[PDB]
Amino acid sequence: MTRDQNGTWEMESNENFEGYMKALDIDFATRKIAVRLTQTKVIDQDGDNFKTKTTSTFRNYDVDFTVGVEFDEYTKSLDNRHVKALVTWEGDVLVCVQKGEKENRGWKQWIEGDKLYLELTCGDQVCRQVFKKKLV
Numbered sequence: 610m611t612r613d614q615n616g617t618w619e620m621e622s623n624e625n626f627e628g629y630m631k632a633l634d635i636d637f638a639t640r641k642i643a644v645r646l647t648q649t650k651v652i653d654q655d656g657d658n659f660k661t662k663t664t665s666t667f668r669n670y671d672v673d674f675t676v677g678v679e680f681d682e683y684t685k686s687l688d689n690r691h692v693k694a695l696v697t698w699e700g701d702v703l704v705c706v707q708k709g710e711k712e713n714r715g716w717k718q719w720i721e722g723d724k725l726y727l728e729l730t731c732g733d734q735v736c737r738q739v740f741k742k743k744l745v
């Protein structure tokens with residue numbers, strides 16, 4: 610029973626964020642800033658209801674969803690695309706498919722220990738992020 614992802618999470622690694630961004634057509638100048646940043650993720654979870662905020666000094670991004678309920682996602686200030694997003698549970702892994710103009714776009718997020726893992730995929734590019742839980 611590791612579906613509880615509540616907390617504030619601080620990035621410790623960000624593998625192939627460059628390639629993921631390039632697959633989303635983010636311009637070089639934006640990538641130059643974005644690749645350098647430590648991100649923080651705040652997850653406020655009540656059962657299958659999630660409110661998430663991802664922050665950095667350069668851009669912030671909020672997305673709220675209920676597991677199992679498809680929603681309209683506009684990736685404002687990121688790549689600024691519209692997708693149909695669906696989050697499901699695969700075991701205790703949170704899986705999101707972002708159906709739209711990019712093939713094989715989605716993410717997967719899960720807990721191990723005091724770490725949160727987030728794998729983001731677009732096309733043939735996978736970005737692997739690891740976050741450590743912040744003490745309250």
Ligand SMILES: CCCCC/C=C\C/C=C\C/C=C\C/C=C\CCCC(=O)NCCO
Pocket residue numbers: 629630633635639643648661663664665667668669670672686687688716729
């Ligand atoms: C918000 C700080 C990062 C700002 C980056 C600025 C410009 C790069 C442009 C496009 C790259 C695309 C997504 C950023 C990666 C990760 C952001 C979170 C993606 C999510 O949906 N996670 C699941 C939340 O439940």
